[PDB]
Every structure is written in C-alpha cells, then in structure tokens.
C-alpha cells in the first residue's frame, strides 16, 4: 500500500471496521455466490527428473466434492515442499452496495449480518469503489468470506486478575 508519500507492507484483515452492514439499515442490494471451479483436493510431488515420489488426498474437501481434482508440484534438490498449503476449497463471496464511510477500503475486515438467522459473518474486502455525485455518496464492495463470528466469545477471553490486589 502506498499511503501518501510512504510505502507500507501490511497483513490483510488486521484492522476490523466498526461499521456493520445490516439488511434493514444500510444495504441497498447484495448478491451471494458459491463456486466449485477452483477446487483442489489431491497433491502430487515429483522429483527434479519428473518422476513421482509421493501423493496426498485431503479428506475434508473430498467429503464435500465426490470427484478428485489433482495438482502437480515439483521440488528441487534444496527445497522440501509442504503439501497441505496447496489444497483449495469451495469459494464463497458477496457483492454489496450500500452506505458507509471512507474507512471501507481494500485490505480490511468487515461484518455482514444474516437476516434470517441473525448470524454475523466476517469478510475481507477485495475491491472497493466510492462515488460522489448529485449530493449522494454510495459504496460498492467485493467481499470474501472468512468465517462465522462466534456468539459472545469463542475462546471466552477473561481478564486474568488476582482475587485480591493486595
């Protein structure tokens, strides 16, 4: 990210915005999608020569999709690859248009509330666009789903204090 005259390298999702999108408050329209096209659930390793040495299958992804979609990676002499990084699962996204502030930009986490179940999910912003015209201001975001926010506290972090201060 180039902010003004400075260059930065940041990790995505560290900052989570205070504003939450709800159906009855500040959402104009949404479109949710799920796709299977880019799924990978088998990894094959080959040596420098091109001959196969090992293979692996991921059971959790294979449970969702009955078919096997393989991937081939090659390791050189001085590298020992990790298979578990190459697996890819089902992709779930959202396309949102609504009202917000100038804080909703690419690389931040946002929260969207489900209307039917009253459940909240966490998304990462991949694309954004802000427009000012004719005295009105609207935003368009492309969101990538991470996980469902746990009701109350997931790990239930309690402030660790002594029973008596002194």
């Amino acid at each position: 990210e180039a902010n003004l005259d400075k260059f930065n390298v940041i990790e995505k999702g560290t900052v989570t915005l205070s504003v939450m999108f709800e159906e009855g408050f500040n959402i104009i329209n949404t479109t949710f999608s799920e796709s299977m096209e880019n799924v990978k659930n088998k990894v094959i390793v080959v040596d420098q020569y091109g001959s196969k040495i090992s293979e692996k299958i991921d059971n959790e992804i294979f449970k969702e999709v009955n078919v096997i979609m393989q991937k081939v990676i090659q390791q050189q002499e001085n590298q020992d690859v990790d298979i578990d990084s190459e697996f890819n699962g089902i992709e779930k996204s959202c396309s949102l248009k609504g009202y917000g502030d100038v804080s909703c930009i690419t690389g931040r986490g946002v929260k969207v509330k489900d209307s039917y179940t009253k459940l909240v999910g966490l998304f990462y912003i991949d694309t954004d666009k802000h427009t000012w015209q004719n005295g009105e201001y609207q935003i368009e975001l492309e969101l990538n789903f991470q996980n469902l926010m746990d009701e109350k506290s997931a790990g239930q972090d309690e402030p660790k204090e002594e029973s008596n201060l002194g």
Partner: protein, 134 residues
C-alpha cells in the same frame, strides 16, 4: 464458524436459539407518594405489566433536554405546551406526537395510540393505549 448461511442453511445444522427478551422486571414504585416500596425490610420487585407501568410513569414525568445524565432520546417535550403557546389543534397534534415518540424507545412496547382529546377550562385530557408483547 464453518457454515455459510447466506444462501441457505444446511439441513443437519440446528439453529442455536431463538432470540427473545427476558422477563421485564423492575423495583416497585408507589405513585401517590413517589417512593420505592420496601417489603420485609428489602426492595420489592414486580414484573411484566406493572414494571412497564412504573417505567412509563417515569418516562412521562421527565423532561427531555434538562438533565445531563440522560441521552437526547429519553424524556418528553410536553412542557413546551403549557400556557397555550400554540393554537389548540396544533397543541393536540404536538401532544400526540410527543407521547408516541417518547414511549416508542422501549423495546418491550410495540404500538402507542392517543385516541381521545378534549379541552375543558385549562385542562387537556387524553386516552393513551399501549400494546406490549405480553
């Protein structure tokens, strides 16, 4: 944290709970003396409709912007009508709107109606009907 319920919920998945408000409870209050009530040497607690009556009485009896502790929503602007500052029809409209907007901030109150309104000497009378979840 794994399911994606925005298109539809899985068949096996069970919803955790249905969201409902707890039973409304409040310290009992007496209206002819304006005090909390002591029972067996301790405060007496009532619930549901009587507690709602206590809350409604307290909300009507307070002014809107007078106190710093409260927010801008709590209170009622009925003190601006004393002395016939407006005409009679405008006074009726304003009184109805003030009462409705003041009462509707409680999540346990569903709808408010101010039906009757009469002018006799310097007294304005009205009938208010409050509908709650109970």
């Amino acid at each position: 944290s794994t399911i994606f319920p925005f298109i539809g919920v899985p068949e096996d998945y069970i919803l955790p709970k249905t969201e409902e408000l707890p039973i409304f409870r409040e310290v009992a209050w007496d209206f002819e003396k304006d005090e909390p009530i002591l029972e067996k040497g301790d405060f007496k607690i009532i619930e549901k409709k009587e507690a709602l009556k206590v809350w409604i009485y307290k909300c009507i009896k307070t002014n809107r912007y007078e106190h710093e502790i409260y927010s801008l929503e709590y209170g009622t602007e009925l003190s601006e009508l004393i002395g016939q500052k407006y005409t009679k029809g405008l006074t009726e409209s304003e009184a109805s709107r003030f009462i409705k907007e003041a009462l509707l901030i409680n999540p346990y109150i569903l709808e408010v109606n101010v039906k009757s309104a009469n002018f006799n000497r310097d007294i304005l009378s009205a009938n208010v009907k409050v509908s709650t979840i109970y």
